[PDB]
DNA sequence: AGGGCTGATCGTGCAAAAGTCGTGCCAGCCGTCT
DNA sequence: AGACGGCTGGCACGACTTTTGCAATCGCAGCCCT
């Protein structure tokens, strides 16, 4: 409408992580193989 | 719903924080923190991804209820924009979603993508989807007269009566799909 | 679909409008509706539709005199993607309405000149009203106007120009006046109230007395329609327990006392 | 009880409780035909605490300066209808409420979807509705719909024999609020000027004048003898 | 090298000659001026003008001629390179920018902002734009397609038309035969456009028309050069009966008052 | 004694090229009737 | 016994799908080179 520029207040590049669970969600039953292959890295999750 | 005992969960090891945030080794502790903020984003994405599939299954059911209730033949004609409309995520979500799921109903079970068809021109404007035209064709091919078989060409002047709109290319590779095999064949002696 | 014409003018003036209308309808053109102040000419043109070959699809009355500005009728006529920031509503849906649809609008007098030359632009090619960086698409769509504003009179104040005017009148549509109407304006008035006597679910229909049904005929009754359900609001709200044939109109909220 | 607040002994007044006591029962909309200060909030609260539901929330919304985020932020995309429960919650300056703030508010209302709520409702304007819908300033179906039962409310030119009773209440009330001994009285100029003044406002505009004038006296022993709202005055 | 005459109908007259010099002029990309008839023919002439143009060449980018009150209008015209200017915060290609090499169907729509004008003035200098914070100017190339449907020597002397407007542009003019000059496919261009609504209606034949509907159209003023009589055609289609008595009843427009 | 500059931390998409189908359309052929 | 016909299958083209390949800018300061 009105031209103008930014008067008033109000997006992101989702790196290996995020775009890992992007990549997830692909299966089930391979997302658990994922899954526990993580946990057996991560000490702090059970 | 979402399956209760098919949904995986994960736990933060409580003893294991407890020993990182208590840790007399700072370079234990970095890295027990390390491991925690990692865990943290891991259980997170797993929380949203299962409530994104739950959204958009719901969505899905929504303008799915009449191919869930009537059965195959009304089935509306949809496509991954249609869906992804009602949501706020992007068609590649859809995608990523429609990938390997299988949801269980009265009806039975169907694969997440099975939803998805394709949009026919029919009489009365309206749109039809490719499954319930194949449904509807191997419904009446199935109810005719052994004597003499259905032409694919008659077969597409009788849908045409409904509003095919079709030149009985399509219906060919529909009855391709349903192994139909051809008038000549499927005649036999009564 | 099947054209509704619940409560349809009991007088020859709307059968023949309504034969003109069943003509019309195998026929894809514009069509311009000259109606009045609550006659009924949006419900006609929704019949029409009803009545216009198949379903037609989409069905979408939207008015741009009803509208906040001319650049939001705009928008509603197509919208540029990544135009400015932000939105009320999803504008290209409107646009996609008349997509597999009909095209109706009311009050168009108050349309902008440069609204109505993109318009113009638009039927003539059928394509979309916003670029949006790439070529618009030309979906099959048809169109209807009604406005209560004579046609020839835009022309003398040159608002709408003479193509716009030319090609946008295919076909007329002339509304008869509420107050002219009275055979058709007592049936209406007998279906609108034994309508309103099932669906307040009232025990007994009270009726009309004659003295009321006198004095709701001398009232001029513009909005055929509008001011007619208006009128009976505001005799139901006089609830009379099917015992009181005053039929007190108290539609106008001013009137006190 | 509610203290019966703007106890109006005219029986128009008396017809008018008694309307807006029958809206009370219903949870269903209704219109409120009043303006500012001849729709005293005091009559609004007084129908909020004879909400049908004592349990029943009342948010008593009105229209307030909020931005197009602000305003989506008040829709559920948490719904302001949300707040309240069970409850009419009297609009203020409907007429000033946006088109599209409008249309939504309506979709809010016995509809849904409109674009391809447990609780009541309550409105009021002190412009003319039928002639903004007649000059397309408002959602005709927002206002047919909000419609369903116009409640007028009396301006204070309306109220002229209960106006001494309204008077004496008020000087009573300022007697107690400012620890006045009692009501010391009117006199004929008094009365008269108070007779003679227009009173643009009904509900404010009285108190405000109360307040003036009690200030400008401050004493509980010699009665009341004139009073003016103007710029200035002197001897 | 295709034909595509498409509807391409009332050449009796010296609308083939009209064409004629079109097609000689059809080769060259210099800038393309025409006066269309005022009301109707103007999109026939430019939708002829883009079959002379070679199918190859490039798109056929059309602009109805708006005011500068619309920044969206000066966004599509200089271009759209910073942020808040249109599309995204990219360089967004402006509709100038989309016509790489294609023809600039300008509307003679006689826009209220002299500046719009001047704006484009520059858009056709030197073959160069510049975007809305375009950091470097961009070198462009494109054919030019215009009209008009006034006095353009009245408005330069009135001054409603930039002087410096019509002396860039306006390497020849194209003049369209009006409708009350035409006047010699009538009966041509009505059979075309009978048949052609008849096919619509599905009508089982030809109808006819009346000598006296020939000498009513001979009488007529016709506004409109090939839209106003086709209007004229579909309205009296509606309202006769195709090889039948109802043909007689002819109907030139829904505006005209009832019989 | 003053400059370079070094690594901590961060982030539910999309888009762009590719693929891929829906639908129609052409070419041949064999069962057949002529 | 050569042609009609319906099937079938190859061919093509816009219109729905989708997948992978990216990984921005940001303030701390002490240490090493000059
Ligand atoms: N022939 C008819 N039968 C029954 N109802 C009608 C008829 N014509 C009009 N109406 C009623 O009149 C109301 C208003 O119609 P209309 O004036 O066309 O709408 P708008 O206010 O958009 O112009 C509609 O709700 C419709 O129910
Ligand atoms: N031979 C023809 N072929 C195709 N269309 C024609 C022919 N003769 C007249 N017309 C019609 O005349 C109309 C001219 O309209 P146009 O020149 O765009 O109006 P304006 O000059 O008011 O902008 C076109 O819509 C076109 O359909
Ligand atoms: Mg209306
Ligand atoms: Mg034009």
């Given at each position: 409408?009105?031209?103008?520029?930014?008067?008033?207040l109000?997006?992101?590049?989702?790196?290996?992580?995020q775009?890992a669970?992007?990549?997830?969600?692909?299966?089930?039953?391979?997302?658990?193989?994922?899954?526990?292959?993580?946990?057996?890295?991560?000490?702090?999750?059970? | 719903?979402?399956?209760?005992?098919?949904?995986?969960?994960?736990?933060?090891?409580?003893?294991?924080?407890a020993?990182?945030?208590?840790?007399?080794?700072?370079?234990?502790?970095?890295?027990?923190?390390?491991?925690?903020?990692?865990?943290?984003?891991?259980?997170?994405?797993?929380?949203?991804?299962?409530?994104?599939?739950?959204?958009?299954?719901?969505?899905?059911?929504?303008?799915?209820?009449?191919?869930?209730?009537?059965?195959?033949?009304?089935?509306?004609?949809?496509?991954?924009?249609?869906?992804?409309?009602?949501?706020?995520?992007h068609?590649?979500?859809?995608?990523?979603?429609?990938?390997?799921?299988?949801?269980?109903?009265?009806?039975?079970?169907?694969?997440?993508?099975?939803?998805?068809?394709?949009?026919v021109?029919?009489?009365?404007?309206?749109?039809?989807?490719?499954?319930?035209?194949?449904?509807?064709?191997?419904?009446?091919?199935?109810?005719?007269?052994?004597?003499?078989?259905?032409?694919?060409?008659?077969?597409?002047?009788?849908?045409?009566?409904?509003?095919?709109?079709?030149?009985?290319?399509?219906?060919?590779?529909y009855?391709?799909?349903?192994?139909?095999?051809?008038?000549?064949?499927?005649?036999?002696?009564? | 679909?099947?054209?509704?014409?619940?409560?349809?003018?009991?007088?020859?003036?709307?059968?023949?409008?309504?034969?003109?209308?069943?003509?019309?309808?195998?026929?894809?053109?514009?069509?311009?509706?000259?109606?009045?102040?609550?006659?009924?000419?949006?419900?006609?043109?929704?019949?029409?539709?009803?009545?216009?070959?198949?379903?037609?699809?989409?069905?979408?009355?939207?008015?741009?005199?009803?509208?906040?500005?001319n650049l939001?009728?705009?928008?509603?006529?197509?919208?540029?993607?990544?135009?400015?920031?932000?939105?009320?509503?999803?504008?290209?849906?409107?646009?996609?309405?008349?997509?597999?649809?009909?095209?109706?609008?009311?009050?168009?007098?108050?349309?902008?000149?440069?609204?109505?030359?993109?318009?113009?632009?638009?039927?003539?090619?059928?394509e979309?009203?916003?670029v949006?960086?790439?070529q618009?698409?030309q979906?099959?769509?048809?169109?209807?106007?009604?406005?209560?504003?004579?046609?020839?009179?835009?022309?003398?104040?040159?608002?709408?120009?003479?193509?716009?005017?030319?090609?946008?009148?295919?076909?007329?549509?002339?509304?008869?006046?509420?107050?002219?109407?009275?055979?058709?304006?007592?049936?209406?008035?007998?279906?609108?109230?034994?309508?309103?006597?099932?669906?307040?679910?009232?025990?007994?229909?009270?009726?009309?007395?004659?003295r009321?049904?006198?004095?709701?005929?001398?009232?001029?009754?513009?909005?055929?329609?509008?001011?007619?359900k208006?009128?009976?609001?505001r005799?139901?709200?006089?609830?009379?327990?099917?015992?009181?044939?005053?039929?007190?109109?108290?539609?106008?909220?001013?009137?006190?006392?």
């Open positions: 409408m009105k031209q103008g520029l930014q008067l008033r109000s997006l992101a590049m989702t790196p290996q992580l775009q669970i992007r990549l997830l969600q692909l299966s089930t039953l391979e997302l658990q193989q994922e899954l526990q292959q993580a946990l057996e890295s991560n000490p702090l999750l059970e | 719903e979402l399956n209760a005992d098919s949904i995986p969960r994960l736990k933060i090891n409580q003893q294991y924080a020993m990182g945030n208590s840790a007399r080794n700072d370079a234990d502790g970095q890295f027990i923190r390390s491991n925690l903020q990692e865990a943290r984003w891991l259980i997170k994405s797993l929380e949203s991804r299962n409530d994104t599939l739950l959204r958009v299954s719901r969505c899905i059911v929504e303008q799915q209820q009449a191919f869930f209730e009537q059965g195959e033949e009304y089935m509306k004609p949809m496509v991954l924009a249609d869906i992804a409309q009602a949501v706020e995520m068609e590649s979500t859809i995608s990523r979603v429609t990938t390997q799921k299988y949801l269980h109903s009265p009806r039975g079970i169907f694969e997440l993508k099975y939803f998805f068809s394709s949009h021109n029919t009489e009365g404007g309206g749109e039809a989807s490719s499954t319930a035209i194949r449904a509807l064709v191997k419904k009446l091919i199935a109810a005719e007269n052994p004597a003499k078989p259905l032409s694919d060409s008659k077969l597409t002047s009788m849908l045409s009566e409904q509003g095919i709109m079709v030149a009985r290319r399509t219906v060919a590779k009855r391709e799909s349903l192994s139909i095999p051809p008038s000549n064949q499927r005649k036999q002696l009564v | 679909a099947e054209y509704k014409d619940n409560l349809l003018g009991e007088a020859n003036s709307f059968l023949e409008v309504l034969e003109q209308v069943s003509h019309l309808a195998p026929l894809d053109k514009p069509v311009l509706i000259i109606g009045e102040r609550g006659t009924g000419k949006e419900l006609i043109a929704s019949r029409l539709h009803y009545l216009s070959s198949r379903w037609q699809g989409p069905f979408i009355s939207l008015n741009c005199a009803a509208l906040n500005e939001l009728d705009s928008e509603l006529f197509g919208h540029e993607a990544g135009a400015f920031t932000g939105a009320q509503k999803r504008h290209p849906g409107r646009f996609e309405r008349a997509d597999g649809g009909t095209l109706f609008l009311d009050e168009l007098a108050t349309a902008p000149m440069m609204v109505q030359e993109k318009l113009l632009r638009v039927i003539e090619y059928g979309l009203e916003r949006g960086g790439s618009p698409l979906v099959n769509v048809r169109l209807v106007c009604a406005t209560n504003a004579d046609l020839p009179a835009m022309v003398n104040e040159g608002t709408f120009r003479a193509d716009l005017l030319d090609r946008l009148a295919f076909d007329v549509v002339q509304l008869p006046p509420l107050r002219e109407r009275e055979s058709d304006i007592m049936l209406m008035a007998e279906y609108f109230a034994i309508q309103m006597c099932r669906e307040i679910k009232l025990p007994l229909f009270p009726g009309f007395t004659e009321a049904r006198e004095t709701l005929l001398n009232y001029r009754w513009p909005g055929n329609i509008r001011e007619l208006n009128v009976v609001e005799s139901v709200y006089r609830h009379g327990t099917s015992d009181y044939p005053l039929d007190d109109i108290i539609i106008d909220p001013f009137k006190r006392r």
